[PDB]
């Protein structure tokens, strides 16, 4: 009772325990956050925009000046603060759910959002019939301006004129008889005003988003942790087609939100803000509030698009993979890629780029394209990866990691160099730098986990970081998915900075040889470096001499001859790494996950840009080897 007790308690404040409440809110508080707000506003609703989604606003504006009539009883109208007695409280007026969802924001977040739109409407900002919004708000304001002077009718009439504004949440229900004693609950942002544009259109975000954190809710809540042995216990199928239905309502939202890049059409009153830079909504909703992202984008796969989707007949059916593609994390934009490069978030992405981070330390062009292999530990790591820029130093270490966030943008940065990185060492080449972003941004997941072999002083840095001080990984393990998408993502960005627009629909949208273990993709990877190199040796000197391989030492001409001795010494070097990794693989990475099939098996089936897949002249590559040319290469217990 007389505790601390945010200042409207101990002010003496019995003012508004004399003020009563008002003769209007014929309802304090009906259904909350749900399919209502769809169109049923407005009708015309053309006029002066499209119609549009609301807040919880044609159900909350207790309407206690039902005569209008002149500002007599209107001097300071004794109703605009009236209405909104009753607030964050034992759980009721515009909020009653919290108390049994026993969480306070919920009701902060209804009275903000009420609160500056009686603000909008004090001003006239509102597109709906409602008839305080007509005439009777200015109306009123210019009656009690009838003083020959303050023709500053919104800027002093913003409360009523004297006391600045807010005045009225304070003293709720039982005098708002339920609080938390921090002030900055107790009073929320008033000394800022977002403009009525970033008003309307956080109107928008907030009652689309917060939805689909509910939406979220339901994924995550039911229909998941079930139809998988098993619930309820009858099937529990009809489960997914609920969010199905989801999808259906919000996507008409989806449309609407379009209509909202327009806004007039002009597509947008202010520019770039903490929320708002609209290039399109997703944008906005993903600047937008702290308790976001869009959502949860713009799922499930109906549109949304460019491609990729599902996604027909509907489903195909065969069954859908909602359940186990979404029931996990992901939790937010995995979907992506689509975007594709049509986009504004890459550009400003590069603005964080290069920025925090002035290249205070970067490393490019070593020419590793046109170098050899070599062990390093006996165990032939790529120069693909040798140098692969990234390494941390003092004023990095475990003292210094207090900052995640600034260590995972450090990493974007890292990320992004690489790309150039890339660029500048195939000096420009867009289907070998798509496959340089795929074992680059896989071998940086590696490192990030910590399994390299050839690393051993920056993987203890890296575990100094991030906890996990014994052997296990988990956190770091815990960290890389889901960094996973914004690092692929900076990949992308930094990629599309010679194309523009254009896609790699000739790459898996996100590279799938992530899953696979590290050193099969390093093998991979060689493998992919091989017989690439072949076609370009033959393109050389083969070209004029002969057709095949020479049915003697070699000779035709001293050019192919040379030709052929830096074929047999590259075949000599292929079937000492061949050797190695063969061993490497039958021993140590045979058959987990069940893998029948031999190292040379594995390289057909996962290559599929088919310049591997080699399959040599004279043939040394292929899916078996010589010496009885059966395969070999198996494991198991």
């Known amino acids: 009772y007389p505790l601390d007790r945010c200042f409207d308690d101990q002010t003496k404040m019995k003012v508004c325990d004399l003020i009563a409440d008002a003769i209007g809110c014929k309802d304090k508080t009906k259904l909350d956050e749900l399919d209502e707000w769809n169109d049923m506003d407005l009708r015309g609703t053309y006029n002066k925009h499209k119609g549009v989604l609301i807040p919880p606003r044609r159900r909350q504006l207790c309407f206690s000046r039902i005569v209008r009539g002149p500002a007599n009883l209107r001097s300071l109208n004794e109703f605009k603060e009236e209405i909104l007695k009753g607030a964050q409280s034992e759980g009721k007026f515009l909020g009653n759910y919290y108390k049994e969802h026993k969480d306070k924001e919920k009701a902060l977040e209804a009275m903000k959002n009420s609160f500056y739109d009686y603000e909008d409407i004090i001003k006239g900002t509102d597109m709906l019939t409602n008839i305080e919004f007509k005439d009777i708000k200015i109306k009123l304001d210019r009656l009690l301006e009838k003083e020959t002077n303050n023709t500053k009718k919104a800027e002093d009439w913003w409360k009523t004129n004297k006391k600045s504004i807010w005045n009225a949440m304070l003293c709720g229900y039982k005098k708002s008889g339920n609080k938390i004693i921090d002030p900055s609950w107790c009073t929320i942002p008033t000394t800022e005003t977002p403009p009525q544009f970033l008003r309307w259109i956080k109107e928008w975000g907030t009652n689309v988003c917060i939805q689909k954190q509910e939406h979220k809710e339901y994924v995550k809540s039911k229909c998941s942790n079930v139809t998988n042995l098993g619930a309820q216990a009858s099937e529990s199928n009809n489960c997914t087609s609920e969010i199905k239905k989801y999808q259906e309502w919000s996507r008409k939202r989806s449309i609407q939100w379009e209509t909202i890049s327009k806004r007039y059409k002009k597509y947008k009153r202010m520019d770039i803000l903490k929320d708002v830079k609209e290039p399109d909504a997703n944008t906005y909703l993903r600047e937008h509030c702290s308790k976001?992202?869009?959502?949860?984008?713009?799922?499930?796969?109906?549109?949304?698009?460019?491609?990729?989707?599902?996604?027909?007949?509907?489903?195909?059916?065969?069954?859908?993979?909602?359940?186990?593609?979404?029931?996990?994390?992901?939790?937010?934009?995995?979907?992506?890629?689509?975007?594709?490069?049509?986009?504004?978030?890459?550009?400003?992405?590069?603005?964080?780029?290069?920025?925090?981070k002035k290249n205070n330390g970067n490393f490019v062009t070593d020419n590793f394209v046109k170098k050899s292999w070599e062990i390093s530990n006996g165990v032939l790591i790529p120069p693909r990866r040798k140098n692969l820029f990234l390494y941390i130093?003092?004023?990095?270490?475990?003292?210094?990691?207090?900052?995640?966030?600034?260590?995972?943008?450090?990493?974007?940065?890292?990320?992004?160099?690489?790309?150039?990185?890339?660029?500048?060492?195939y000096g420009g080449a867009r289907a070998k730098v798509v496959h340089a972003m795929k074992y680059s941004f896989t071998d940086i997941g590696s490192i990030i986990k910590g399994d390299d072999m050839m690393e051993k002083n920056s993987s203890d840095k890296i575990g100094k970081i991030l906890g996990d001080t014994d052997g296990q990984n988990e956190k770091?393990?815990?960290?890389?998915?889901?960094?996973?998408?914004?690092?692929?993502?900076?990949?992308?960005?930094?990629?599309?900075?010679?194309?523009?627009?254009?896609?790699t629909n000739e790459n898996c949208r996100f590279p799938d040889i992530e899953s696979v273990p590290q050193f099969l993709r390093w093998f991979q990877?060689?493998?992919?470096?091989?017989?690439?190199?072949?076609?370009?040796?033959?393109?050389?000197?083969?070209?004029?001499?002969?057709?095949?391989?020479?049915?003697?030492?070699?000779?035709?001409?001293?050019?192919?001859?040379?030709?052929?001795?830096?074929?047999?010494?590259?075949?000599?070097?292929?079937?000492?790494?061949?050797?190695?990794?063969?061993?490497?693989?039958?021993?140590?990475?045979?058959?987990?996950?069940?893998?029948?099939?031999?190292?040379?098996?594995?390289?057909?089936?996962?290559?599929?840009?088919?310049?591997?897949?080699?399959?040599?002249?004279?043939?040394?590559?292929?899916?078996?080897?010589?010496?009885?040319?059966?395969?070999?290469?198996?494991?198991?217990?």
């Open 292 to 356: 976001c992202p869009c959502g949860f984008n713009d799922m499930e796969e109906m549109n949304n698009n460019e491609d990729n989707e599902k996604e027909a007949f509907k489903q195909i059916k065969e069954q859908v993979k909602i359940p186990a593609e979404l029931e996990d994390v992901i939790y937010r934009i995995k979907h992506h890629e689509y975007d594709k490069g049509n986009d504004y978030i890459c550009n400003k992405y590069k603005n964080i780029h290069d920025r925090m």
């Open 476 to 503: 770091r393990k815990k960290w890389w998915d889901m960094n996973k998408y914004h690092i692929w993502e900076s990949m992308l960005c930094g990629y599309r900075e010679a194309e523009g627009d254009t896609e």
């Open 525 to 637: 990877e060689w493998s992919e470096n091989f017989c690439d190199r072949r076609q370009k040796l033959y393109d050389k000197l083969n070209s004029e001499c002969i057709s095949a391989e020479c049915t003697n030492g070699s000779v035709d001409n001293s050019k192919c001859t040379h030709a052929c001795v830096n074929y047999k010494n590259y075949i000599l070097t292929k079937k000492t790494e061949y050797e190695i990794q063969t061993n490497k693989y039958d021993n140590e990475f045979k058959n987990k996950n069940s893998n029948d099939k031999d190292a040379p098996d594995y390289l057909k089936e996962k290559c599929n840009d088919n310049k591997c897949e080699c399959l040599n002249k004279h043939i040394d590559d292929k899916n078996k080897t010589w010496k009885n040319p059966y395969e070999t290469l198996e494991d198991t217990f």
């Open 393 to 425: 130093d003092p004023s990095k270490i475990c003292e210094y990691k207090k900052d995640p966030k600034l260590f995972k943008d450090f990493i974007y940065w890292s990320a992004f160099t690489e790309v150039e990185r890339l660029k500048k060492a």
